[PDB]
Design a protein around this ligand. Structure first.
Ligand SMILES: Nc1ccn([C@H]2C[C@H](O)[C@@H](COP(=O)(O)OP(=O)(O)OP(=O)(O)O)O2)c(=O)n1
Ligand SMILES: Nc1ccn([C@H]2C[C@H](O)[C@@H](COP(=O)(O)OP(=O)(O)OP(=O)(O)O)O2)c(=O)n1
Ligand SMILES: Nc1ccn([C@H]2C[C@H](O)[C@@H](COP(=O)(O)OP(=O)(O)OP(=O)(O)O)O2)c(=O)n1
Ligand SMILES: Nc1ccn([C@H]2C[C@H](O)[C@@H](COP(=O)(O)OP(=O)(O)OP(=O)(O)O)O2)c(=O)n1
Ligand SMILES: Nc1ccn([C@H]2C[C@H](O)[C@@H](COP(=O)(O)OP(=O)(O)OP(=O)(O)O)O2)c(=O)n1
Ligand SMILES: Nc1ccn([C@H]2C[C@H](O)[C@@H](COP(=O)(O)OP(=O)(O)OP(=O)(O)O)O2)c(=O)n1
Ligand SMILES: Nc1ccn([C@H]2C[C@H](O)[C@@H](COP(=O)(O)O)O2)c(=O)n1
Ligand SMILES: Nc1ccn([C@H]2C[C@H](O)[C@@H](COP(=O)(O)O)O2)c(=O)n1
Ligand SMILES: Nc1ccn([C@H]2C[C@H](O)[C@@H](COP(=O)(O)O)O2)c(=O)n1
Ligand SMILES: Nc1ccn([C@H]2C[C@H](O)[C@@H](COP(=O)(O)O)O2)c(=O)n1
Ligand SMILES: Nc1ccn([C@H]2C[C@H](O)[C@@H](COP(=O)(O)O)O2)c(=O)n1
Ligand SMILES: Nc1ccn([C@H]2C[C@H](O)[C@@H](COP(=O)(O)O)O2)c(=O)n1
Ligand SMILES: [Mg+2]
Ligand SMILES: [Mg+2]
Ligand SMILES: [Mg+2]
Ligand SMILES: [Mg+2]
Ligand SMILES: [Mg+2]
Ligand SMILES: [Mg+2]
Ligand SMILES: [Zn+2]
Ligand SMILES: [Zn+2]
Ligand SMILES: [Zn+2]
Ligand SMILES: [Zn+2]
Ligand SMILES: [Zn+2]
Ligand SMILES: [Zn+2]
Lengths: 140, 140, 140, 140, 140, 140
């Protein structure tokens, strides 16, 4: 089931993300394997999406990460995430990892980062926080 | 009312936040002036808070912002924030601004940043996003 | 957007549904295009899925429909659906249509049934109920 | 308490159901004996109720069952049913039994079917699914 | 509909309430006539119900009112009551009226008090608060 | 943490309560130390606040207690209080104690009453109900 959800998230990212380089999506799943929340990476809702704003490095000032969006959407709609797992097509950065911990999510399921990534340092802080705070990491 | 909530938020930060430089709190409030969520800045729950982890600039890798915490708590407990206002003792950084927009919060109430702040560039992106996305900014 | 959700729903069905003839999925989506609930067709959770139980016509006694599942999951988790739209890879049968009406879903988005379908009579009652009760039907 | 809730449901059916032959109601009860959801059998809300549409067999194309309505109402309003019991004046048919299982309801409390019933075959499938999926049945 | 709910409430009180003098129940109902919460008058859950504790006037120190119970249950289970109506077999006392106003209930439906009632003074304050705060009172 | 929440509640009462003699506030806290609900004592929302209505003894006919307001607000907004603790600047009266028990709150954290209080008899009934119904009382 986890691998199928990962495949489902890869497709969601390809369908919806306007990021020209890296399309990211995340699914928050409860203990009955039901979907509690979904997000993809994009500029905030209604924010004009121009070519200049989607180029690197400018885009980092504007882009909302997929995992942050799944959690913000649950806050917006009042969907309780405590105790769920998060399945994400990309390992969460340090800022998303903070949100995952504080939102009560207990497990991150994803793929091992391409260690040519420019996010490797951010991911190192993610792993330090996850392991000490007791959030499991599972790689498919 | 907004001013009394800001004062309450200031006291919340002084009571709870362990940041040695800048203690921040935020309150999310609905149209009846009822409190829907509260947060303060701090390291993730259960992350050992050593002096080295709270020193600047290392603390930025670990500290969870007050507004991010209030939103993440609402996702954790399934408390709907759509349509609420957020009263914060510090203007939200660009990342918190993305969360505010995506969680359906309509209005930010805070103090005008001290123009000696090191966060002015981040706040500059916050206001560009708030203005295009139609989030009202109210200064006390 | 509706078309991308329909495509995502199609992939969800192909990944998860064990029906050997017709795999169906549905997405319930609010006015911000956020996903509130998801379902696919399958036997009840934990019911052993033997070849005999999945053969037609015996499977109709056991199979839970995708739209029924998405609504039942929302009841299970307390996720409010009032005012949402439902995007489904198959037009809802008359029983699913009753659930859609009673759960406050306002709009059905799907494909026009293949006029070789064995469900045309059931769909005929669905549309009579949708029209009198004011549920919009939108075909992709 | 269970028998009093059953009596309460019998009265609710008599008060509200327009079915000319069989009036049905159901109460979803949590582990503190609080009422989480209530339904009765009827045509969908706002659907014209004519004599022709309430006659047998035509009515089966239109009538929403009491247990299906209690669950659809919880989906509509975002009331969490997971782990509750359902007390119903009539044994749930196979379609309602699927919804009961998927909505997380753990126990069905009702009266033994009159085994002159035309629903006996549908009830046989209900019992097969309940017993294998671990939903208890209690007869008063 | 309001009259049928009042009748159902009367029966609920007769079935469940242990008050030897006056059995009271209340139903909180949304704009679709769905039941959001139900209560009846009784001592707190688990408080031993001796004859001395149910005798007047000692019972007033312990008895929980039906309308207070329906609201407290909604707080317990997180069921939103904002905008609902309350149908009660007895006019709410001044304390219940404060709860009704603060929980966002918009309308009280009940019977006109028997002018031999010992609660007329309390009801007098109830109506002054309902009128200034804009809660509609409807008598059956 | 409990003592800091008590200090936070004392300030909230001083900021917001218009009671000329005794300002009261209460915080409902979950097992992760997150704030679920907040209240202070005051006349009902929108009720004209005149000097005559805030004088003793007239005010008791109108004033909503802080703990009752925290619970009514949770009912209004659909915030689930079951299993939380309540931290209050004043010991709950017998009527608030009934609401605390019925709303699923499991622990009262407060300060020992000034035993020159005119509420001592009401508090005696509170303690009888709390101890028999299994709600803990903790004094700071
Ligand atoms: N189901 C959804 C819908 C939206 N979003 C997030 C992704 C972006 O951060 C933001 C906005 O998404 P879009 O840009 O796709 O949608 P807009 O509303 O901005 O419209 P448009 O596509 O015209 O830009 O919301 C999400 O995570 N999940
Ligand atoms: N009501 C609360 C409780 C917690 N938090 C946030 C602040 C921090 O980002 C994180 C953890 O807070 P603390 O460090 O104060 O609490 P811990 O659980 O880590 O315990 P300790 O005080 O021993 O560090 O949760 C919050 O915003 N609001
Ligand atoms: N995210 C989910 C998970 C489940 N279901 C529904 C589909 C079926 O009606 C039922 C059970 O699904 P599965 O058969 O896939 O899962 P089980 O729990 O039965 O396990 P298994 O795959 O071993 O049969 O729940 C759903 O609609 N959406
Ligand atoms: N508290 C309620 C209210 C309604 N329903 C269900 C029963 C029917 O399936 C549908 C419609 O009920 P009614 O026919 O009684 O109400 P309408 O809104 O259709 O009005 P009318 O009575 O004029 O037909 O809603 C329910 O289960 N519980
Ligand atoms: N569906 C319910 C269940 C309970 N209550 C309220 C009524 C009383 O104020 C309290 C306790 O009800 P009971 O006394 O009937 O139930 P107990 O749990 O105390 O058990 P017992 O019947 O053995 O006294 O809860 C309610 O309003 N609605
Ligand atoms: N965050 C809040 C807001 C309000 N209340 C309660 C306290 C009173 O019982 C009632 C009304 O509060 P106020 O009198 O402060 O507010 P009003 O809306 O009545 O306005 P005003 O201050 O002009 O009287 O609501 C509360 O407990 N918590
Ligand atoms: N935890 C993360 C990290 C990154 N991203 C998003 C931000 C960018 O849109 C993209 C990475 O862009 P790039 O590969 O160009 O750095 O992935 C995300 O959604 N979640
Ligand atoms: N929108 C923001 C921006 C910053 N902070 C927090 C992070 C740090 O803990 C502190 C600022 O630290 P300093 O003053 O050392 O930059 O405020 C916050 O909670 N919300
Ligand atoms: N509204 C509907 C109608 C049908 N189905 C499911 C039931 C079966 O699993 C499949 C159709 O099977 P067949 O094509 O063999 O009739 O679609 C569904 O999920 N929703
Ligand atoms: N599980 C079930 C089965 C049936 N019914 C309803 C449908 C009809 O309105 C009535 C039975 O009608 P009859 O006895 O004429 O078949 O009961 C129901 O609400 N729930
Ligand atoms: N608004 C009110 C007022 C009273 N009661 C209850 C309290 C007692 O149990 C009963 C009245 O008792 P008596 O008739 O002896 O005064 O009604 C109630 O539930 N709601
Ligand atoms: N459990 C209680 C008891 C009392 N109060 C409020 C009611 C009055 O506003 C004040 C006490 O007023 P006094 O001290 O004049 O009796 O405290 C409260 O909020 N909660
Ligand atoms: Mg966009
Ligand atoms: Mg800590
Ligand atoms: Mg299965
Ligand atoms: Mg009708
Ligand atoms: Mg009892
Ligand atoms: Mg006021
Ligand atoms: Zn990230
Ligand atoms: Zn920030
Ligand atoms: Zn169907
Ligand atoms: Zn049925
Ligand atoms: Zn009362
Ligand atoms: Zn009190």
């Amino acid at each position: 089931k986890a691998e199928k959800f990962y495949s489902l998230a890869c497709y969601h990212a390809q369908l919806f993300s306007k990021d020209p380089n890296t399309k990211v999506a995340a699914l928050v799943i409860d203990n009955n394997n039901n979907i509690a929340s979904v997000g993809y990476n994009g500029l905030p809702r209604g924010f004009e999406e121009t070519s200049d704003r989607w180029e690197k490095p400018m885009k980092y000032n504007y882009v909302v990460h997929a995992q942050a969006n799944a959690i913000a959407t649950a806050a917006r709609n009042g969907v309780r995430l405590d105790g769920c797992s998060i399945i994400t097509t990309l390992f969460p950065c340090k800022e998303c990892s903070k949100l995952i911990i504080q939102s009560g999510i207990r497990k991150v399921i994803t793929s091992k980062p391409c260690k040519d990534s420019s996010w490797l340092e951010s991911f190192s802080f993610s792993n330090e926080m996850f392991d000490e705070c007791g959030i499991e990491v599972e790689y498919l």
